[PDB]
């Protein structure tokens, strides 16, 4: 049940991820670090107003094929 989702990077361009609905959020953050070089603890992923949290899966957020996750960092 593999699908392609998209992540909107900091520049606006999207990267493509090959994922399963049961894939964890840390699994997704590991793939984003490989392409963007941002450590997982610095990444924040937004979808439908929710920030994806570590211990959960993509299916927990109803993330379907070709949905877009929005990557943002932190101003502190």
């Amino acid at each position: 049940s593999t699908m392609c989702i998209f992540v909107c990077t900091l520049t606006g361009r999207c990267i493509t991820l090959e994922v399963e609905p049961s894939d964890t959020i840390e699994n997704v953050k590991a793939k984003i670090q490989d392409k963007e070089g941002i450590p997982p603890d610095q990444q924040r992923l937004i979808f439908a107003g929710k920030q994806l949290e570590d211990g959960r899966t993509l299916s927990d957020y109803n993330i379907q094929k070709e949905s877009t996750l929005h990557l943002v960092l932190r101003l502190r």
């Binding site: 909107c8 900091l10 520049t11 606006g12 937004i46 979808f47 439908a48 107003g49 379907q64 094929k65 070709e66 949905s67 877009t68 929005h70 943002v72």
Partner: peptide, 13 residues
């Protein structure tokens, strides 16, 4: 292919 994602805000580059 078209998908429709709801949003509560927009993060703009």
């Amino acid at each position: 292919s078209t998908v429709f994602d709801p949003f509560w805000d927009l993060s703009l580059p």
